[PDB]
């Protein structure tokens with residue numbers, strides 16, 4: 001219903017590691033200023049599409065020499081009972097959930113200038129899987145989904161280490177150019193997808209996919225977009 | 241006193257093919273609409289820093305899937321009798337001359353919005369070397385230099401196959417991120433430097449270096465910038 005969602009270079013995509021092109025040029029992700037103090041607080045919001053944390057100024061990220069970004073927000077994608085809800089897949093496998101940290105190039109002053117422009121926005125993405133332990137970092141956010149279950153509801157939460165939400169090795173990722181996965185589906189987004197996953201307890205994953213309400217009288221669930229063709233794009237890998 | 245001319249990531253650079261990262265993601269260049277009709281004519285100008293050919297609308301160049309560009313102009317860098325004048329070097333070797341074909345990202349309607357923006361401008365570069373035969377395509381430009389010997393003069397030339405000023409091998413090239421090499425030296429420029437060189441006659445190379453006059457009572461020669469340090473950038477290659 002936005003023609004942009006029918007462009008040729010959309011996200012998400014199915015990742016095929018063996019077909020990823022290794023390039024030495026893809027150096028380790030640099031994330032500075034992500035260890036936020038408890039004050040000030042941050043806005044967490046149920047928009048009926050996802051849960052969205054607004055991030056402060058000062059979160060700086062580089063994809064390479066002279067290619068720098070500042071973090072804007074983070075949100076999540078998830079499924080339902082017995083059904084996975086990641087956006088990206090790996091060899092056809094859909095993981096339980098998926099975190100997206102959205103950034104704006106320092107070469108643009110406004111997001112509306114950056115939409116549609118090559119490298120204007122960059123998203124860091126990581127897969128969330130079931131493990132045995134309870135995740136501390138994720139609990140800070142999952143604990144407050146109760147408060148904001150309505151739709152439009154919002155709360156304030158204490159500062160947290162945003163970088164603790166992400167996987168172990170910042171030198172191991174896949175990378176491609178695609179689009180926003182929501183309308184306006186703008187192209188020129190650089191997607192970086194960690195090779196390693198983060199682990200949540202089955203308790204936490206049930207919570208995430210069963211606490212929030214979306215449009216009208218309906219649970220917010222399966223908020224991922226279908227897989228989109230690569231159409232000739234080659235996914236790059238930072239490791240052989 | 242134009243600040244980006246003092247940036248960390250400038251052009252040109254010395255290329256060391258041993259140290260280039262092989263990146264299978266780098267596909268062959270697609271050029272469309274470069275085979276021009278004779279009419280309308282094109283403007284060829286001695287701007288006192290180079291000879292520049294203004295290219296018409298409709299020349300599309302892609303660095304790959306979703307990496308789309310339009311050609312603006314081309315110009316040349318050269319030396320002097322017994323002196324090489326290429327901008328880029330290879331293992332410290334300087335070639336007799338160099339052609340630059342400057343392009344604008346389709347995401348931008350004008351150069352000034354692209355400047356300093358990531359991938360906003362893209363240059364196709366090829367070395368010129370001495371061969372035994374008169375180069376046909378080059379002769380159409382070089383035969384007119386006498387008419388534009390004076391600083392700030394110009395002339396009209398018939399359209400030609402612009403892609404015949406370049407190497408026939410479009411699959412094999414180095415690519416790196418850098419800058420314009422003249423003020424304002426804005427960064428974010430994708431430079432693509434062909435592996436194959438182009439052949440001009442000794443007479444042609446002499447015409448290029450010995451015909452034009454620049455500022456002062458001065459010959460327009462040796463119009464190349466010094467090489468700039470990589471400063472931790474990696475150059476990619478399209479071939480193993």
Ligand SMILES: CCCCNC(=O)c1ccc(SC2CCCCC2)c(S(N)(=O)=O)c1
Nearest residue numbers: 049050075100102111123180181182223224
């Ligand atoms: C049907 C479910 C829709 C849920 N998606 C989002 O809420 C969402 C909201 C925002 C964003 S990014 C944002 C940045 C610029 C303006 C609009 C989109 C993204 S994404 N996956 O990063 O493209 C997703």
Ligand SMILES: CCCCNC(=O)c1ccc(SC2CCCCC2)c(S(N)(=O)=O)c1
Nearest residue numbers: 289290315340342351363420421422463464
């Ligand atoms: C020694 C005197 C300088 C010689 N250089 C040029 O004339 C020249 C003139 C123009 C250009 S491109 C750029 C000029 C300003 C904005 C539009 C494109 C470039 S380049 N090598 O591709 O950056 C070079």
Ligand SMILES: [Zn+2]
Nearest residue numbers: 075077100181
């Ligand atoms: Zn998202």
Ligand SMILES: [Zn+2]
Nearest residue numbers: 315317340421
């Ligand atoms: Zn040039």
